[PDB]
Amino acid sequence: RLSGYCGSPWRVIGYHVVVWMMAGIPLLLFRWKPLWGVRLRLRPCNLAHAETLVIEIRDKEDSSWQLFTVQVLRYYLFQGQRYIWIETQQAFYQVSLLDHGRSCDDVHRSRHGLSLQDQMVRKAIYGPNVISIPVKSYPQLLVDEALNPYYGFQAFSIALWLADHYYWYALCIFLISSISICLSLYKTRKQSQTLRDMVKLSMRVCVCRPGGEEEWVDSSELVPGDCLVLPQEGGLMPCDAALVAGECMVNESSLTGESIPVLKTALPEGLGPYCAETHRRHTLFCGTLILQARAYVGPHVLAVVTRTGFCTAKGGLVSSILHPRPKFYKHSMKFVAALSVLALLGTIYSIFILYRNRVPLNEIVIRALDLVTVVVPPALPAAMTVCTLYAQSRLRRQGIFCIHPLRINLGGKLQLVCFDKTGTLTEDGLDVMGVVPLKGQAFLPLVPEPRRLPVGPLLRALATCHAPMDLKMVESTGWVLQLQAMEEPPVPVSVLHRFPFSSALQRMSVVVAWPGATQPEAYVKGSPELVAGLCNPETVPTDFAQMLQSYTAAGYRVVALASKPLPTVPSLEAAQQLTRDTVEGDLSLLGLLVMRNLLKPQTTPVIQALRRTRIRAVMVTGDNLQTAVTVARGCGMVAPQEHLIIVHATHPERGQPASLESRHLALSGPTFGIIVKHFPKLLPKVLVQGTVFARMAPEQKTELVCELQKLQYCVGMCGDGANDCGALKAADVGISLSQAEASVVSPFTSSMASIECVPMVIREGRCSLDTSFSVFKYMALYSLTQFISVLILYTINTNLGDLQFLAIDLVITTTVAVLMSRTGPALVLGRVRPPGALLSVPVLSSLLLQMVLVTGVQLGGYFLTLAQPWFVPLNRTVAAPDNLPNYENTVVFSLSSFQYLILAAAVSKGAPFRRPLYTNVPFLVALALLSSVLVGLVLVPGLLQGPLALRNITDTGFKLLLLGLVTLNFVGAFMLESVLDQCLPACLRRLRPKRASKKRFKQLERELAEQ
Ligand code: BEF
Ligand SMILES: [Mg+2]
């Protein structure tokens, strides 16, 4: 979208120093609204002529950053892209002027190289072509990524807690908080360091010069417009260059997955110089391995570099990764608003209570601050981390070496997973199916089967045909051959010599000679068309075009073979004289070679299990459409009235054609690029039912992932390595199943190449999310009940014992908050998903329901003691209010502890998708021990309340009533928690519509209305 620029470098060196010195404290409110902050300090409004400080306007692009330029030609760095200053009309553009030179192609064709006349300025403007992530902020993570406000509030509460004694509690909470924040810095920095090491290329590449000068220069000094020479052996390509002469052969192993070599461009011209937007074969991609290059009539092969930098395929992924994105983070505003609106009256209420008792003005405010800080606890991230560590440790047991505590629960409610077919949907390496290289005319279907089981010259012909596919062909047949071969058992054969590949014509002729029993002959292979048209006098083509179309329609690779018997003397003469034209012209059709692209047998059960839980399975790959549809039919997950489409980028007006094979559609790269613009009127109608995404460039994968995230979807794209690097961070779940190459950084990293891990990782994420939600609910309820307990304790104007409270808090943190998250998911596959977004009726129908019960059970116990002959504690007369061990405080503390115990016991729920309740034996024994010690703290008259100062009372009849009340509460809490499991009233009221959002459901229901 459009963006405006403005200039305001400086006015004068005046009050700016004082402003900078003053603004050191209020930076917390200064950071928000940068535009107002920079406009309130200085504003030298003028035209952009020599302005260093620029501000991005908020006219259409609703964001803001900071920019700093350097004077060397005015330029700066902004998300990798560099802007070029032009004085012709005083405006800023990108590096697209010289590249888009669609005029006077003669000078482009005459580019042969430069030495020293046009290098300094080019190096000054373009600069280094290397890719490096800066590590400037090595200290500065504290000031960069720690400007959230669970840390400012934590620091504010630290001083308030340090005002009192609070030794052990503060010592524990600071030690806990300083470890996670220190480990996060190392975790963040290791990713950047390994990315910097992985993205590096420093090698010496020769550059030809006019006049006959050759020397070795580094790859750092490389600018567009120069000529690069290609060595015969072939190395790596550091920049996106283009061939100008000769013929070369390369494979797009890291660009499209398949290692299928493709012919290069041609010498004839007539169009523009490069035309990268309208040319695909002519464009030579970089970052790929070169197998072999062919020379020409010239002295050597030369290449021309027309564009390099972050705009190429290598830099596109890097730019996509370091770009900011447009749950688990929007659910805190409601909670903080609720606590604020619940505690606004609490402060004034407590002030009113304190004002009645004539509280001194010394500790009047510390009590209010403690009350404010007690209804919100600084341990929620700690609880989340300690709940997550168990799942993280269990995940690593199955060979999954991933570190992402905050990403485990994100992918719990996965809706669809984007698969890829290069190594994760098909067995690595090309295997041999039933091959039957029969004769030509008078053919019969006979008979696809494992090779070399029958006997005959075909076995020897296939064995002698050779040059990662040759090794597999030799090994996967059973008969081991490279100079001599036995276990025929009869009529042994051996090879003597072979001929190299010829790039001009696809021919592979191998000469064999066995003078023992049979006669020597020659075997050749090549394209089926060549052997069909070159064998007319011997094998006339009869009914040959009917099977070729069917074989090619399935994406199978077909290569034919041929042979011609010859006498011994000419055969040996041809073998020794290194000739090839003496055997061509008249041969006999040997047959054809057929390959198979079948998927792994274990993938089908996983696909079937994934399709019965209303989870979509989309296919994303860069192969041809025929291979994609063949793989889809082979998997057989679904195919109701499959429809095929073809690009129509020929006229401004266009229409989608209708062709034959609750429906699915196939989309391609150019098809997706043409259907967009307009996006909102053509993409939503096809992005829901489409399931085929073949023949798409890797750069479009990032755009597709970004667009899918805006539709409230849950992407589950899994990478393989060196194929999809940019589409790994903006997605929800990213799993790498190979050590090379994108496995250095990923949301999930595993050492397994099977799809069976997806269901178990999904179940683990769901269980972790459920445990985290339960823990958060328990902590919120405990905070609320502590708040009301403290509020009701202000009637007598007393304070709880610091030692007992500290001990009980430590016990709760080390016993309940730890062993609670030990539950795991069962070995079953559920239908529904754990529902988050705790702002609905079924989730909010328990908070107040438990709160009213707690308030009633506290009020009854507090008001029941009025019928007992006890003396009034010293509270209104002269006494020490710091410590008052009276009966009321003791009974209130006992009731609060019992409430904590019952909440910790009855916090559990159902959801049988996880492990059953009677499984966590350590949790059960810990609860039993807690109950036993709680009973013994007040039952036995033994010496235990000495340092506790509990004021033990010789009570005889009140203990029975207390036990009856606690048993009634125990039998009531379970009933309250179990009667609300059903949601029949929820569906009795919400009909027919139930959701006020998620427009995808509305689209689905309006689409199924007419079908
Ligand atoms: F088939 Be791939 F690796 F996109
Ligand atoms: Mg792959």
Numbering used by the authors: 36 to 107, 163 to 416, 420 to 560, 572 to 585, 611 to 790, 820 to 1169
Lines from the paper:
Adenine nucleotides (AMP-PCP or ADP) or phosphate analogs (BeF3− or AlF4−) were used to stabilize hATP13A2 in the E1-ATP or E1P/E2P intermediate states. However, in the structures obtained after incubation with BeF3− and AlF4−, no significant difference was observed. By comparing with known E2P structures, we suggest that both BeF3− and AlF4− incubated structures are in the same E2P state. Accordingly, we found a polyamine entrance binding pocket positioned in the endo-/lysosomal luminal leaflet with an outward-opening architecture in the E2P structure of hATP13A2. Spatially, the entrance site (denoted as Site1) located among TM1, TM2, TM4a, TM5, and TM6, had a chalk-shaped architecture open to the luminal side where substrates were captured. The chalk-shaped EM density, in conjunction with the results of a liquid chromatography-tandem mass spectrometry (LC-MS/MS) experiment, suggested the presence of a linear endogenous spermine (SPM) substrate. There are also several negatively charged residues, such as D254, E456, and D960, located near the entrance to the chalk-shaped pocket, which may be important for the recruitment of positively charged polyamines into Site1. The gating feature of Site1 was further supported by all-atom explicit solvent MD simulations of hATP13A2 in the E2P state, which revealed that, despite being deeply buried in the membrane bilayer, Site1 could be hydrated. In E2P state, conformational rearrangements in the cytosolic domains and transmembrane regions induce the opening of the entrance pocket Site1, and the negatively charged amino acids are enabled to recruit positively charged polyamines (shown in green). The low pH environment of the lysosome may favor the recruitment of polyamines from the luminal side to the negatively charged entrance Site1 in the E2P state.
